[PDB]
């Protein structure tokens, strides 16, 4: 199946999800430069304080920790979104070493890591029928950078010796998903897709513009896992990042 290797990689993942060649593909670089302040963009509402996390699972190409997402509770809305997005999980994708690792690149700037907090539409009532949507999901995108420790990762850190190979999952309760968040929410936003397969066309990107500082130690546990099932030879999950993809006919917003 797919993954991130020579030979079942991005480069080859279209010919299984003819989608990765479509018109809103992501990720994307985000020129800076280019990118446009949009005065129509309403105030941007994350509001997670009553956040319920599940489960941390070893997917074979990223960890998830889910949420309880039955009730109405830790909610994304405003900004480019219309009504409002319920979170569901997060998930990162990082790099073998701390030059590489993000999906979105700013300037072409590589970040160490980015973090996807993922909500879905509410008005589609769950999401796997929001993911057939086109506004279907927002995704809150975070760059990690490689220098003083996040105090609210730890927690997540120190739970990955538990689930270190596919397919492994563990109890995972009262994570706050509020100490993963930079102090500012100035954003870029653009309509895209899932970063690895099945690719669909569903997300709403919400960029944050400022990154959050992870030490160098709580990265390199990140590294320690692995992409194979437990009794199969090691293959650490590291760069488990897509290129960025032509940005075709679309606009990157900017909130500042
Ligand atoms: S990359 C990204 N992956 C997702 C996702 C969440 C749940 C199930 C499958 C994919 C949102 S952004
Ligand atoms: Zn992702």
Redesign the pocket.
């Not at 897709?193 to 690895?196: E, G, Y």
């Given at each position: 199946h797919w993954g991130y290797g020579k030979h079942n990689g991005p480069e080859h993942w279209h010919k299984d999800f003819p989608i990765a060649k479509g018109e809103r593909q992501?990720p994307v670089d985000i020129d800076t430069h280019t990118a446009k302040y949009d005065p129509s963009l309403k105030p941007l509402s994350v509001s997670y304080d009553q956040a319920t996390s599940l489960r941390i699972l070893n997917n074979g190409h990223?960890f998830?920790v889910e949420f309880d997402d039955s009730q109405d509770k830790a909610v994304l809305k405003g900004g480019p979104l219309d009504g409002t997005y319920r979170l569901?999980?997060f998930?990162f994708?990082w790099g073998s070493l701390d030059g590489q690792g993000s999906?979105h690149t700013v300037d072409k700037k590589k970040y160490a890591a980015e973090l996807?907090l993922?909500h879905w539409n509410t008005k589609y009532g769950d999401?796997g029928k929001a993911?057939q949507q086109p506004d279907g999901?927002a995704?809150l995108g975070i760059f990690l950078k490689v220098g003083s420790a996040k105090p609210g990762l730890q927690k997540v850190v120190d739970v990955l010796d538990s689930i270190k190979t596919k397919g492994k999952s563990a109890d995972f309760t009262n994570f706050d998903p509020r100490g993963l968040l930079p102090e500012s929410l100035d954003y870029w936003t653009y309509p895209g897709?899932?970063?690895?397969p099945?690719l669909?066309e569903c997300?709403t990107w919400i960029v944050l513009k400022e990154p959050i500082s992870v030490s160098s130690e709580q990265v390199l546990k990140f590294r320690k896992l692995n992409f194979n099932g437990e009794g199969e030879p090691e293959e650490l999950m590291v760069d488990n990042w897509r290129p960025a993809q032509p940005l075709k006919n679309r606009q990157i917003k900017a909130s500042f």
């Open positions: 992501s990223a998830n569901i999980q998930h994708h999906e996807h993922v999401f993911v999901l995704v897709s899932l970063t690895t099945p669909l997300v």
